[PDB]
């Protein structure tokens, strides 16, 4: 037996948790944990990214971006979440709007939890890029004028920052390697690498390797398309890496 | 990608809310929520009341108890996801302890939300009986002595009480029919089912007749076991439904 009818889904009950905080204008503990349970529900799992966007949860992120301008947890939460929808290729074009664009775009410039929100923010941006300029359709702002601001936003965080985030496979960052289409996404995607196995090798070394990471950084730096600053940070990736494996490899 | 290694499941998330709540001495609409959304995912789904037990729920229940003590929708709410874990024979061993027994026993009383508290507990201890005698232990209350309390419980519930539950199978209760080891839970749920029928003929009447009830309550009607009053009970439910 139960209340009512129906069978209540994970998503959408983390969804009316938010909608209720929202009502009373309150970002507090349960606010910021619902958006992190959807952050990770939606991790590697499409079903859940749709469930989130067909119960109006963009509306729901760009209600509570606005009353809680400066709740850095909060936003980090939000861009994570929606990080991972920006993953599924097919639920892209929901976020090719000129309205989410034009949010995306703007916290690149974020410095809210160090560099999670502008670097999540540039991840959504990234798989969107990836599509093609031809993917933009009449999206504003200009396709160049966001890219632009991608760049700026990666070369501003330092490379060995601390992190708030945490990831199972490289698989969808590791699909942004070998194209010539969005080279900034390219970057952004070596950078990810590059920051976790400079800090936390011992997490993440092994995984890039175990998932192909070495041949794809090594394409990268063959590829006229790649650019020399990402030419150079995935040789440090693939020395740090190989470093990595002779010292950790069993040799009895 | 995700802020922390693990996989939040939906069980476990609901408890951290009610733990938080707990600690923040608030019963709010939240806390009635979060209760109600296991209460909701609980249902026929055995997954969900071992994650609930494995969990610490029972503690959690019972401080919610204990803690809130007036909130009738709260104690409904925590009553009826206990009545779904009670439904999971083999997790039934679990509430079998002094302390949730004379719990269960004690709310037979209850006034709290009309009826609804004092039925779900009568729900839980009628499954917990269809077990049988030596499934007591040793627990107390003596097993005889919460029989009788389930006797007068049911007795005391007005027929035509409007409802706040939902049932999209009958199945668990209609488990309870075609058994002479507890007559108590027998009567249990054929009170359950005509009150149903009695006040949302247009509801039940459909789903107990798919789900093969007229020829249990036929069956309970021609049954040494049952008690004179189980059997009136049946008659007036084939009554509604056969009239329907």
């Given at each position: 037996g139960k209340l009512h009818v129906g069978k209540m889904g994970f998503v959408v009950t983390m969804l009316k948790l938010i909608q209720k905080k929202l009502l009373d204008k309150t970002c507090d503990q349960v606010m910021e944990f619902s958006w992190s349970a959807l952050w990770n529900i939606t991790d590697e799992t499409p079903d859940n990214c749709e469930m989130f966007l067909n119960f109006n949860g963009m509306k729901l992120f760009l209600d509570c971006l606005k009353e809680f301008p400066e709740k850095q947890e909060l936003h980090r939460n939000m861009l994570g979440l929606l990080g991972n929808v920006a993953e599924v290729k097919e639920l892209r074009p929901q976020l090719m709007t000129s309205q989410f664009i034009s949010v995306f775009s703007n916290l690149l410039e974020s410095k809210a939890d160090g560099i999670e929100v502008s670097y999540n923010a540039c991840g959504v941006l990234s798989h969107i890029m990836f599509?093609?300029?031809?993917?933009?359709?009449?999206?504003?702002?200009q396709r160049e004028e966001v890219e632009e601001r991608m760049w700026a936003a990666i070369q501003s965080w330092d490379i060995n920052s601390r992190r708030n985030i945490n990831y199972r496979s490289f698989e969808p960052i590791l699909r942004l390697l070998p194209q010539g289409i969005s080279p900034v996404s390219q970057h952004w995607a070596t950078w990810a690498l590059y920051n976790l196995v400079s800090v936390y090798p011992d997490k993440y070394c092994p995984l890039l390797i175990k998932e192909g990471g070495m041949p794809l950084l090594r394409d990268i730096i063959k590829m006229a398309t790649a650019r020399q600053e990402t030419k150079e940070m995935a040789r440090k990736v693939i020395e740090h890496c190989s470093n990595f494996k002779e010292e950790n490899m069993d040799t009895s």
């Open positions: 599509d093609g300029p031809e993917a933009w359709g009449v999206c504003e702002p």
